[PDB]
Amino acid sequence: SPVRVGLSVDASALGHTIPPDYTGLSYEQAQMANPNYFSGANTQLAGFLRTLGRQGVLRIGGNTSEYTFWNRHAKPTAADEHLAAGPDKGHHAAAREVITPEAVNNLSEFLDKTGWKLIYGLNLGKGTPENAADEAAYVMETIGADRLLAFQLGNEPDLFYRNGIRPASYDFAAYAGDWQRFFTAIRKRVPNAPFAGPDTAYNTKWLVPFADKFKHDVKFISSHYYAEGPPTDPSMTIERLMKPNPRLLGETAGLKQVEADTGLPFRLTETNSCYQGGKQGVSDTFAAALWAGDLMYQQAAAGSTGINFHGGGYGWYTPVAGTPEDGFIARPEYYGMLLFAQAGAGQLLGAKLTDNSAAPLLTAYALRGTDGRTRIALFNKNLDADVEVAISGVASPSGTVLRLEAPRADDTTDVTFGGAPVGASGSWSPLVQEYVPGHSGQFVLHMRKASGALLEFA
Ligand SMILES: O=C(O)[C@H]1CNCC(O)(O)[C@H]1O
């Protein structure tokens, strides 16, 4: 029988207002070597972003940001015209790539077709300040201040050493002098250049002193997060992915304190399920839709300004897979982001679960939407327990449910939202939308194990 849980929505318990550009994706800077990829002509990839949000952020960076070399006279290799750069697996040095004005021209048209804003990595790992100044100037010239949210001066500088980019002795003090040199050079060329940093996992030895030192030089703090890894570790399972992650709660609390001490908001500029490109059997499954949807709400409730799920190529954890030549598809994780896209923006509300200790991985979020209608995003992340949710605190003549479903937690396909798969170019409409049982003040919703649901009340 289902676990019988109570959900109390409290319209007077005001949480954070979710911004309209909360959602986003992160890609490898190597992908900019292919001017066909981030292009006005990539109508397929553009459709997938527009469906994730009318407003959102495209972040370009990753380990490949230390291996990409902007040049004003560069042209793409014939290999570059066909490159699909998936997530760097973080074993060896990435391949050297060149970025061309043509690729930056085409990125502008892509941002025009998607309506999204840009976070743009610069090569602090291996490049020169003067070349970063020049690439920033061209990007400002072509993208504009309105669409360009921030430059980032290196990716995971705290990992440079492990990755062979700097010697073992490289520390925050060394990165701060590097950061200051790039910053100064870029500002000579681009006086209004916006920045974010330090573009790594929260920690005490890099992210906290970054904020204190560079607080007058940045728009916001940029953090990374992987739930799991390494992928060779048999610990890293769907079971563990469905559980609360105490490292995440701590880093989130670290970010809120930085915001208190410096006034700087925080965005999770690079995140996914499992690091080193993801884990087959975990990252590429329906479980990843429950994890991603849940994370978006959890970080929104904590006061995050937004999120950027890393992906590209056919990476195990990519929300969107494919190429201009072969087309694009929505991986399971995409469906978690689609639930958030359909909820829309508004102000988070109090939503308390009781009688739920035998279904402890059920999470719930209530939202007063910008259109005034109440919504509830539920993730039944229990792999073995069905739930029956008695919903109080909502007075409404009628609620509907869109279900986030696959026949098994580990399915790599068979993922639907609202009784429908995503189609070509991000096309989606609900084909199954049932009413929630009960009346004003007492709704009852069933959810099978390992399912999700979005409730919308009139
Ligand atoms: O999957 C991973 O480990 C990522 C970690 N951050 C940098 C990168 O995005 O390039 C990836 O290597």
Numbering used by the authors: 18 to 475
Publication passage describing the model:
Surprisingly, siastatin B also inhibits both β-glucuronidases and human heparanase, which cleave β-glucuronic acid residues but not sialic acid or N-acetylated sugars. Herein, we show through crystallographic analysis of protein-inhibitor complexes that siastatin B generates both a hemiaminal and a 3-geminal diol iminosugar (3-GDI) that are, rather than the parent compound, directly responsible for enzyme inhibition. Notably, 3-GDIs are a new class of iminosugar glycoside hydrolase inhibitor, that have been shown to inhibit both GH2 and GH79 β-glucuronidases.
To examine the structural basis for inhibition by our panel of synthetic gluco- and galacto-configured iminosugars, we determined cocrystal structures of the 3-GDIs and either HPSE or AcGH79. Crystal structures with 8 and 9 bound to AcGH79 show that both of these inhibitors are situated in the same binding pocket as that of the galacturonic-noeuromycin 4. Within the iminosugar ring, there is very little conformational change between 8 and 9, and both maintain the 4C1 ring conformation seen for 4. Furthermore, the axial 4-OH present in 8 forms the same H-bond interactions with the protein backbone (with the carbonyl of Asp105) as seen for 4; however, it also has an additional H-bond to an active site water, see Figure 4. The axial 3-OH of geminal diol inhibitors 8 and 9 is found within hydrogen bonding distance of the catalytic nucleophile in both structures. The axial 3-OH is also within 3.0 Å of the εN of His327 in both structures; however, it is unlikely that there is a genuine 3ax-HO···H-εN H-bond interaction as the 3ax-OH is oriented approximately 80° to the plane of the histidine–rather than being in line with the plane, as would be expected. Furthermore, the εN of His327 forms an H-bond, at the appropriate angle, with Glu45. The galacto-configured 3-GDI 8—the breakdown product observed in the active site of HPSE—inhibited AcGH79 (Ki = 5.8 ± 0.5 μM) more potently than did EcGusB (Ki = 137 ± 3 μM). These 3-GDIs are well accommodated within the active site pocket and form an additional H-bond interaction with the catalytic nucleophile.
